[PDB]
Amino acid sequence: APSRNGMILKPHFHKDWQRRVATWFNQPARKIRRRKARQARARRIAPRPASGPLRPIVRCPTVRYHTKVRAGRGFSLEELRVAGIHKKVARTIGISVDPRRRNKSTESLQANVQRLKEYRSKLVLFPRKPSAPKKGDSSAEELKLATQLTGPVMPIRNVFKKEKARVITEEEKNFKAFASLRMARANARLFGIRAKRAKEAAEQDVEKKK
Amino acid sequence: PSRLRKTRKLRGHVSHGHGRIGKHRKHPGGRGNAGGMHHHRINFDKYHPGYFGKVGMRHYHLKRNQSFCPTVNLDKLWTLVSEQTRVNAAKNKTGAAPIIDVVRSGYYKVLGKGKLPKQPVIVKAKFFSRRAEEKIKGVGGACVLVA
RNA sequence: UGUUCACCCACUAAUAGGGAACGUGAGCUGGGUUUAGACCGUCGUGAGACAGGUUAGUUUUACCCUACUGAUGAUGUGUUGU
RNA sequence: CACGAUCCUUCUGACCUUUUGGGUUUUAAGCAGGAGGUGUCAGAAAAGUUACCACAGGGAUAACUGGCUUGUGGCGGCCAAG
RNA sequence: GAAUGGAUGAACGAGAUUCCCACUGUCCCUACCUACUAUCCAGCGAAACCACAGCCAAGGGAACGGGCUUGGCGGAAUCAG
RNA sequence: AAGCAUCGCGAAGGCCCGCGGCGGGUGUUGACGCGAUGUGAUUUCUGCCCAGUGCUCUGAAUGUCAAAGUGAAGAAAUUCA
RNA sequence: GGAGCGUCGGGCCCAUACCCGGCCGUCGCCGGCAGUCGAGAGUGGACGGGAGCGGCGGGGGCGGCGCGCGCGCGCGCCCGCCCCCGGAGCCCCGCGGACGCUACGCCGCGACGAGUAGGAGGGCCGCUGCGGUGAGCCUUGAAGCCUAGGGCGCGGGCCCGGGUGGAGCCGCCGCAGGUGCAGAUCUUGGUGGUAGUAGCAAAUAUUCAAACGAGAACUUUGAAGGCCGAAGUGGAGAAGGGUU
RNA sequence: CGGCUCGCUGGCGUGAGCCGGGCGUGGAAUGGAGUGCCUAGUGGGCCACUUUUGGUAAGCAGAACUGGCGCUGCGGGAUGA
RNA sequence: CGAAAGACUAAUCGAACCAUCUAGUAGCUGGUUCCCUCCGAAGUUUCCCUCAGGAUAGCUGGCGCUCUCGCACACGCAGUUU
RNA sequence: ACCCACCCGACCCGUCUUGAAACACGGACCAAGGAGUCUAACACGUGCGCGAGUCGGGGGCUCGCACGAAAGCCGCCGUGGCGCAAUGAAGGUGAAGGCCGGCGCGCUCGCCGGCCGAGGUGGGAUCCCGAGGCCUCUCCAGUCCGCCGAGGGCGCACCACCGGCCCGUCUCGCCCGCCGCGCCGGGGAGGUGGAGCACGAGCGCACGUGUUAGGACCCGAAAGAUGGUGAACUAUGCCUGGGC
RNA sequence: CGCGACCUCAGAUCAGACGUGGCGACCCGCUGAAUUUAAGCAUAUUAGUCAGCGGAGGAGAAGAAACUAACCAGGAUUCCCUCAGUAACGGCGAGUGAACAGGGAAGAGCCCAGCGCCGAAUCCCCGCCCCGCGGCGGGGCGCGGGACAUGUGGCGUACGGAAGACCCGCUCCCCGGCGCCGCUCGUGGGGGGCCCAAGUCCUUCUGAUCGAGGCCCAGCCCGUGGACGGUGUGAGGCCGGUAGCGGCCCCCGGCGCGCCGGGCCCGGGUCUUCCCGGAGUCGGGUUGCUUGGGAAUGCAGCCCAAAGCGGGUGGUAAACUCCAUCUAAGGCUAAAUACCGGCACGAGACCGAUAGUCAACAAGUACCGUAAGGGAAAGUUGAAAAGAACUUUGAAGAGAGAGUUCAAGAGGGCGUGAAACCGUUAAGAGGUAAACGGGUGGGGUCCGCGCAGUCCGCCCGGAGGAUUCAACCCGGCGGCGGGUCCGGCCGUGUCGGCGGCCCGGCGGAUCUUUCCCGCGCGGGGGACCGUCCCCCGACCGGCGACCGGCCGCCGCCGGGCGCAUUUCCA
Ligand SMILES: [Mg+2]
Ligand SMILES: [Mg+2]
Ligand SMILES: [Mg+2]
Ligand SMILES: [Mg+2]
Ligand SMILES: [Mg+2]
Ligand SMILES: [Mg+2]
Ligand SMILES: [Mg+2]
Ligand SMILES: [Mg+2]
Ligand SMILES: [Mg+2]
Ligand SMILES: [Mg+2]
Ligand SMILES: [Mg+2]
Ligand SMILES: [Mg+2]
Ligand SMILES: [Mg+2]
Ligand SMILES: [Mg+2]
Ligand SMILES: [Mg+2]
Ligand SMILES: [Mg+2]
Ligand SMILES: [Mg+2]
Ligand SMILES: [Mg+2]
Ligand SMILES: [Mg+2]
Ligand SMILES: [Mg+2]
Ligand SMILES: [Mg+2]
Ligand SMILES: [Mg+2]
Ligand SMILES: [Mg+2]
Ligand SMILES: [Mg+2]
Ligand SMILES: [Mg+2]
Ligand SMILES: [Mg+2]
Ligand SMILES: [Mg+2]
Ligand SMILES: [Mg+2]
Ligand SMILES: [Mg+2]
Ligand SMILES: [Mg+2]
Ligand SMILES: [Mg+2]
Ligand SMILES: [Mg+2]
Ligand SMILES: [Mg+2]
Ligand SMILES: [Mg+2]
Ligand SMILES: [Mg+2]
Ligand SMILES: [Mg+2]
Ligand SMILES: [Mg+2]
Ligand SMILES: [Mg+2]
Ligand SMILES: [Mg+2]
Ligand SMILES: [Mg+2]
Ligand SMILES: [Mg+2]
Ligand SMILES: [Mg+2]
Ligand SMILES: [Mg+2]
Ligand SMILES: [Mg+2]
Ligand SMILES: [Mg+2]
Ligand SMILES: [Mg+2]
Ligand SMILES: [Mg+2]
Ligand SMILES: [Mg+2]
Ligand SMILES: [Mg+2]
Ligand SMILES: [Mg+2]
Ligand SMILES: [Mg+2]
Ligand SMILES: [Mg+2]
Ligand SMILES: [Mg+2]
Ligand SMILES: [Mg+2]
Ligand SMILES: [Mg+2]
Ligand SMILES: [Mg+2]
Ligand SMILES: [Mg+2]
Ligand SMILES: [Mg+2]
Ligand SMILES: [Mg+2]
Ligand SMILES: [Mg+2]
Ligand SMILES: [Mg+2]
Ligand SMILES: [Mg+2]
Ligand SMILES: [Mg+2]
Ligand SMILES: [Mg+2]
Ligand SMILES: [Mg+2]
Ligand SMILES: [Mg+2]
Ligand SMILES: [Mg+2]
Ligand SMILES: [Mg+2]
Ligand SMILES: [Mg+2]
Ligand SMILES: [Mg+2]
Ligand SMILES: [Mg+2]
Ligand SMILES: [Mg+2]
Ligand SMILES: [Mg+2]
Ligand SMILES: [Mg+2]
């Protein structure tokens, strides 16, 4: 029974939970295991970034996350095309490619491009044989580094531009933000209705002639 | 700590501090929140008034990220910014005034509480309460929207 | 008559009335109530019901304590007997 | 004293809100006010039977004895009209 | 009270009654006899039950006590019943 | 239980089994048979009641009666017929 | 001639109540003590001039707010001093302060103390294990067990002595819990009374001798008397048993 | 006492609300108060004086009041809630 | 399966046994483990398919806090009275 | 502490019960075992860390882990939770007020400059000021130290009360705004709903108590379901033998 | 009335292949309760859960959008945190209950059908030769058979593809073998093997020591080794081990080089011309299940049944209308994840033989039940069997002696040996069952005494003996305390140096792109501010934060001080 003041509460212990409790005595082991395997992936892919492949800048979705920026799944085809990379080669120089990404905004497009431009620059493409052909980089940048990059390659920092202390013009001052919004909101609400009344008015004027 | 618990002091006494007329029987009310209508009524209706009944409008696939307008009062708008902005200003002599981007620092709506200090500003925000604008303007400042 | 009760015959001095867990089932009997089978009647749509009739239907244990009945003994009187 | 909650329904109310990517219309959902009822009346949706019975409990409760009581039954006075 | 069968009916029945004859220990009204027991002994050898225990009168008391009160009173260890 | 008396069925059937099948029992059967009941040898009878509750027969003459189909309006969901 | 009834006396009896005293605990005290004067407390102390037996010449109040152990005093000699506790000698000491003071300590006054159900506190009560810690204990004897031995604790319990035993165990501070039993017709095991009791009574039956043998009511051999009485207590099989 | 406020009320005035000042023990007896959280058991009761309903009554049933028992020993009432 | 009695179905039958769901549910019976110290009840309220149970107040405890002055210098409160 | 003696006292515990020594139930005896747990979730209390914050998870970086499956560290340190804002079914809105001077007719309404800046009343621990005394070995002067303090103040926290602010809703009103003059937008005064605001108190961990959900203090049904094993007894049918 | 093609279909102990059962912790596919809760009960709940059936693998399943969203948008699945006990469902009761977004682990992508081009360019099988051969493979050669046009193979698949011209740049990838080199992270990959420090030192207990005391520095030695176990108690150093980028020997993997045998003439952009998609599927109705999915989230049966600027989705039914977003009806895919079964390891604040698994042992054993099924009890002599020779009594069991043992008061179910219960011995008692509380008394048992207990300790007085000093100075050492803060180190608050500021760093939503470097942004300077450090002087708290002198006092040692002092002793 309840007894004088305190959350009514519905706790979900009606099915056979005890049969299916999950205990985390693993966890430490699992932190270790994963880490070992991690270290072994690095030692496998000797000079390639442990991180993995270069991944692109991307905004998050939804009015919430909106302003923040993440890593993407991979660079979209427009972005390769423009940076001048063949899509089946990108996979082979450490460049994540998703192809399902639309590209709407020209800004993001050029950002990612600037990544790939940046990347190819600071990449140390080894040759096929030790006998050097074109593309594969110089013996200088090879001896001085067969060196990995620990941590995600070209890390995606979400950045701000500082707006200096202005003056506030009298014209800037004058604005009436609170109203302008309330109007705006209303003008969306009503946009459809009005234009039905206008369509009725134009019909009444044409009907007057006939 | 069993050590410190009551059951250690009950040893010997018979009913184990559950009385002996009425006993520690299994489930005499009924299990859980049974009887909110009948027989446990009184409790639910002097300690959870409003439990029973429907009220308002369904909303089938709510998604919280649409209604995400976190707010900041004017009271502490200048907390968003490094003290030396608020210092260099009440100085400078230009009548420059800084910008405070609220959508930077994590809010979308400048609500109106608090006395705001006699110190011109600009304030970028997705929204404003009427009074929050009137306090900024009264200071000598620009409310600037940003989509 | 299963009866308590009742009634009637006969004798008699008289055929007074009552109690003891409505004395008394490891004392009996079990005829009646009061399981289960079944019959009738009345009731019930029915399963069934009936202080309404009928018939058939396992009555366990004492070797303890006591009580009681009988039976050895016991303490004393030095020991024994009369 | 003459009357009734949640849930559902029904009507009535605003140039009302929502009907979800936007718009118009239907429909629906809201908000608020009356109504349809719960008489076991603070509001489950509900017939029996068991002698074939079953379980948990109850001397918080019947069927004996025994207590109290003595109306009733039984016995006995006082008065004295007959 | 009429195939929810009504009324009958020889024969039959470990069926329910009633009566008569014979018969008898059913009874007056109990006695005797036999065998197996019980009994006693040698050998062997369980069980149920068991708060403590174990003489009564009355009293009061959860209104019928072995224990309490007040009286009566009390004598090892046992046997067959 | 014999006897008596009803009821159903002519087989693409009655009755009944089966989770299911061009399944199975009755049936290696066919009305003097199979199945369903009641009463209960023989003798002798077996009255009246079709209002009730059952069972059954007949059916465009005919109240109600679903899903579908047909028409109706509507922008349609639809509603009406 | 009440050990009766009624009305009345003196005296005497004893409850866990009342009174005084001790002791344990609780509660209360703005309780006391980190080291100081002080018991209706109603001041202490510079420091400067002017002076001295002067003083503050105020209520049958019966008195507290003012008076007779000194204010000035005895010594150095009208003038100077009126001195320092590393020493006044002490009932108060402001120079430094317990034998006392684990301040979760210690001390002092009061009042109080029934308790189921129930709650709360403190247990240097107790059991098992972990971190710490006892330069802990232990084959010159651990644990456990026994004990008409000696003690402590209100108690939970504990410490000692003796015996037995033969390998491990404990105190303190913390942590942890599968932590305390008279009962549950509780579970398992073991043991009494019952009790040397109830019992070893269905189907007629045993006896005499001899042998073997440590030992014979019962084994075997002989004799006698008996029974089953061919629908058998006789001879043979099935099923079942599984070496009988 | 003095002055302000009012959109109430009103022949003027009421009434209420505000400021600003002026005045101390206002029957006996007793006692330190106030206040907020969390909260267990309990929610079968019974007995007595007085009141009182039912009932012929009851160690009966049911109420009021206080106090008991229940939770409680102790002296007395022989024994006893 | 039953020539029917609810008979029989491996000592089981008005629904066999074995195992699992299962530690089923129980307003009901039963038990419920050391010491001291302190405070210390209720059996009444309203609601309840409530009357052997819950809820709710009441009563209990615990924890506190705010203040109060025996530190010659008190305001409030009461199972009274005037 | 072992036995014995006598005087007085003394009924058997457990339990339900208004009432138990009961002619209420459990208990012959002894040993060992045996019942309020653990997880989750809330609540209040309490301890610690930090404080308009807090926070650690989950992950990652540091080692073969002896102790480590620890410990430490991380623009991940904050994705994120919880908190710092409420209210409304929703669309949505969203916590300040005052004063002063000026301009609009001060119109208890509208617009422009300056100052103060979370209102007020009563009570309130505490602080502050303090007339004044109260003495000092003399008559006055007289700074220092106190003791108390009549009286007056600033007044925490909390309470009572009044105004005030935000959201919902109603009533009644009159003004203002513009890229879109509109069934647009914004205000005012007065009531009334709100788990509000009115210079923040939370977060993390730990302990306790309570209340549930879980086997949920321990033990207890009559039943209910799923899936199997049985006709050696027994019930009936059939086949193949026996018997009277 | 033949022979022949094919088609559909048979038979073979025809040739070679493969499936069959098990295990089932985890996974996939069906199937699917009821106890229970709701204080009754029927929907709901329990639960898509137990039981039932099927099929797997080291994982499975999933998966490369007919996706989310509505944003400035993201981009296969899985998994964790969060979302969220939320939206939603529910006799709107009890109860149930997700999803996207955000941060993480991991991360990997693809192939057909179709539409088209290529003399079917393809495949399987037979037979000879060379290689290779314990996962039947490579090359060659056969008018040797079949499959295949009812469609094999290359190209290509929605991220678009094909074919043409001319712009550009240039030509390594795979496998079957055969060798050979570097033994390739727990710091030499895996497996196996065998090896590697140091006391039995000195006394001494003991039955036996691993104990106890000692050992050129807690003692000797080693210690990259002091984990553990064994050994007649307690062991770093007796033995095994342990430690160690320690040793050797095998065997096996994995990667580096060389040679051979084959295969393989394998690009990109730019303009032109073509090509483009899965039907009884979608979708609608419907019924039943199912879901949080609400005028239908999914999955079904039945009926109906499409389209191509279509189709689906866009969490309220319907029509119109814009937007968005995917591309369904074919398929493959490692990885984080799972794991009460198995093989093999490690560990534990767990249990310690009524516990812990039913099971420490000849346990799923004995035994029970026709069967399904049920299902125990049961550990311990001692260091060593040294397990009691021999005598004796007895038919023997049993004893009596003797012996072994440290011990048999350890004697083969034997460590310890509790209680209940019994036998005996000793003491005491006994007609109100026993037992108990309080109070004494009697007796016993041991304990403590005393063969005076007159118990000690100061100070003092006296009579006897006793050595050396106190007191005093002198020398040395140590300590305390102190001011003059005297001299110097030391540090707090303030002021002066703008001195560290660049020879002082970090931080900053303070600025400047006059700078530099890398591509309006990133990094680094350069200013600015905040914060942390050098130099001296002055004032002040002169602070336990210290030195040096000096002073004062204390103590210790050593000198002297000889006895009216000084302690000792009675
Ligand atoms: Mg990563
Ligand atoms: Mg108690
Ligand atoms: Mg109890
Ligand atoms: Mg309790
Ligand atoms: Mg209760
Ligand atoms: Mg009788
Ligand atoms: Mg009798
Ligand atoms: Mg009898
Ligand atoms: Mg009879
Ligand atoms: Mg009968
Ligand atoms: Mg649309
Ligand atoms: Mg009956
Ligand atoms: Mg009957
Ligand atoms: Mg019957
Ligand atoms: Mg009764
Ligand atoms: Mg009676
Ligand atoms: Mg009849
Ligand atoms: Mg009739
Ligand atoms: Mg008795
Ligand atoms: Mg008939
Ligand atoms: Mg009819
Ligand atoms: Mg008490
Ligand atoms: Mg040993
Ligand atoms: Mg444990
Ligand atoms: Mg016991
Ligand atoms: Mg006998
Ligand atoms: Mg014969
Ligand atoms: Mg024979
Ligand atoms: Mg024979
Ligand atoms: Mg009760
Ligand atoms: Mg009670
Ligand atoms: Mg009840
Ligand atoms: Mg108290
Ligand atoms: Mg008390
Ligand atoms: Mg009861
Ligand atoms: Mg009773
Ligand atoms: Mg009685
Ligand atoms: Mg009972
Ligand atoms: Mg009994
Ligand atoms: Mg125990
Ligand atoms: Mg807290
Ligand atoms: Mg609570
Ligand atoms: Mg249980
Ligand atoms: Mg619980
Ligand atoms: Mg059970
Ligand atoms: Mg049921
Ligand atoms: Mg229920
Ligand atoms: Mg229930
Ligand atoms: Mg039920
Ligand atoms: Mg479900
Ligand atoms: Mg299953
Ligand atoms: Mg298989
Ligand atoms: Mg797979
Ligand atoms: Mg696909
Ligand atoms: Mg949350
Ligand atoms: Mg569910
Ligand atoms: Mg093809
Ligand atoms: Mg060695
Ligand atoms: Mg050893
Ligand atoms: Mg060792
Ligand atoms: Mg469902
Ligand atoms: Mg919609
Ligand atoms: Mg797949
Ligand atoms: Mg065992
Ligand atoms: Mg054992
Ligand atoms: Mg065991
Ligand atoms: Mg043992
Ligand atoms: Mg051994
Ligand atoms: Mg043993
Ligand atoms: Mg020994
Ligand atoms: Mg021994
Ligand atoms: Mg032994
Ligand atoms: Mg003895
Ligand atoms: Mg004797």
Give the amino acid at A205. D
b/e A63-92 (16+ beta carbons within 10 angstroms → b)? ebeeeebeebebbbbebbeebebeeeebee
Nearest alpha-carbon partner for A141 in A121, A118, A117, A116: A121
Angle at A154 between CA A148 and CA A155, to 5 degrees: 110
Angle at A88 between CA A87 and CA A92, to 5 degrees: 110
| Residues A80 and A90 sit within 8 Å (Cβ to Cβ) | yes
Collapsing DSSP states into helix, strand and coil, what is residue A87? helix
Q: Indicate the residue of A3, A168, A178 with minimum beta-carbon distance to B130.
A: A178
Q: How far apart, in Å, do the first and last CA atoms of chain A sit?
A: 80
Residue with tokens 């981007």: B101
Neighbours of A108 (CB within 10 A): 20
Which residues of chain A form beta strands (DSSP E)? 57-59, 69-71
Nearest alpha-carbon partner for A52 in A42, A61, A62, A64: A42
Collapsing DSSP states into helix, strand and coil, what is residue A95? strand
How far apart CA B66 and CA A59 sit, in angstroms, is: 16
Nearest alpha-carbon partner for B132 in B91, B74, B86: B74
Q: Name beta bridge partners: B143.
A: B123
| Interface of chain B toward chain A, CB-CB under 8 angstroms | 28-30, 32-33, 35-36, 40, 43-44, 47-48, 51, 65-66, 68, 85, 88-89, 92, 94-99, 101, 103-104, 120, 122, 127-130, 132-133, 137, 140-145
Which uninterrupted H or E stretch holds A68?
none
Q: Enter the resolution in angstroms.
A: 3.7
Nearest alpha-carbon partner for B133 in A22, A178, A121, A64: A178
Written as six digits, the tokens of B129 are 């309460």
How far apart CA A114 and CA A119 sit, in angstroms, is: 8
Q: Which residues contact B42 (CB under 8 A, 6 or more apart)?
A: none
Q: Indicate the residue of A64, A67, A168 with minimum beta-carbon distance to B142.
A: A168
User: How far does the CA of residue B121 sit from the closest CA of chain A (Å)?
Assistant: 8
Ligand nearest to the CA of B6: 4
Which uninterrupted H or E stretch holds A35?
helix A27-44
Written as six digits, the tokens of B101 are 């981007």
Q: Which residues contact A173 (CB under 8 A, 6 or more apart)?
A: B137, B140, B141, B142
**Method of elucidation:** cryo-EM
Query: Could you tell me whether strands A57-59 and A69-71 are parallel, antiparallel, or unpaired per DSSP bridges?
Result: antiparallel
Nearest alpha-carbon partner for A122 in A145, A98, A89: A145
String of DSSP letters for B1-67: -GGGSTHHHHTT-SS-SS-SSS---S-SS-STTTTTTTTSHHHHHHHSTT-SS--S---TT--GGGS
Nearest alpha-carbon partner for B136 in A178, A181, A161, A163: A178
What is the sign, positive or negative, of the torsion defined by CA atoms of A146, A149, A153, A155? Answer: negative
Give the amino acid at B36. G
Nearest alpha-carbon partner for B126 in B113, B139, B137, B110: B110
Which residues of A26-107 form beta strands (DSSP E)? 57-59, 69-71
Are A167 and B140 within 8 A, CB to CB?
A: no
